Amino acid sequence: MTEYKLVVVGAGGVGKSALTIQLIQNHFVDPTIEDSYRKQVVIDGETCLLDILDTAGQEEYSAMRDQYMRTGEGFLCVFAINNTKSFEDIHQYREQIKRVKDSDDVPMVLVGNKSDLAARTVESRQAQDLARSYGIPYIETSAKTRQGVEDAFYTLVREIRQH
Numbered sequence: 166m167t168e169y170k171l172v173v174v175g176a177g178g179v180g181k182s183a184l185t186i187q188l189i190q191n192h193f194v195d196p197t198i199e200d201s202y203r204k205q206v207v208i209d210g211e212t213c214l215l216d217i218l219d220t221a222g223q224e225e226y227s228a229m230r231d232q233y234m235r236t237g238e239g240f241l242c243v244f245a246i247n248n249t250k251s252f253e254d255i256h257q258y259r260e261q262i263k264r265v266k267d268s269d270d271v272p273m274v275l276v277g278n279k280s281d282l283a284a285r286t287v288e289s290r291q292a293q294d295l296a297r298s299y300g301i302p303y304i305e306t307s308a309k310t311r312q313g314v315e316d317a318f319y320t321l322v323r324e325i326r327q328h
């Protein structure tokens with residue numbers, strides 16, 4: 166069976182775990198433990214197996230994180246739309262992924278999470294522009310309402326398929 170190795174990266178607190186648990190278990194929810202989840206799904210008719218690594222356990226740029234990240238095929242790069250720092254951080258996360266995969270074109274999607282919360286501090290247009298300047302998709306999402314959550318992950322699989 167076709168497996169898709171996915172990795173969820175981004176600043177602590179943006180909703181990585183909430184997005185993953187919503188995708189896998191269909192409900193909304195330890196920010197230090199790092200682990201992988203699996204689930205058999207059908208995407209565009211293809212029955213397949215997602216293997217999802219939920220990163221945590223310190224900002225980033227330890228070799229330990231790379232030891233975990235290196236096995237990933239595609240990356241879900243998440244920020245929170247009310248946390249400007251988490252959005253600035255995407256540049257670094259993207260750089261770290263390119264270095265660990267030793268590639269200039271790694272399957273990746275930008276995810277603006279916490280779409281249910283108002284008074285956003287990152288406008289959609291700006292995030293759409295970042296994704297476009299990177300040549301990757303942008304999906305907005307809420308781990309809380311589930312809006313956009315399948316679109317974000319399934320989109321990542323479609324990027325893996327096309328690379």
Ligand SMILES: Nc1nc2c(ncn2[C@@H]2O[C@H](COP(=O)(O)OP(=O)(O)O)[C@@H](O)[C@H]2O)c(=O)[nH]1
Nearest residue numbers: 177178179180181182183194196279307308309
């Ligand atoms: N309102 C709202 N809160 C969220 C969302 N996603 C995560 N959270 C909350 O943000 C905090 C961090 O979420 P978590 O998934 O643990 O973030 P992580 O550190 O990136 O794994 C927790 O209070 C979560 O319940 C979301 O989409 N909407």
Ligand SMILES: [Mg+2]
Nearest residue numbers: 181182196221
């Ligand atoms: Mg977490």
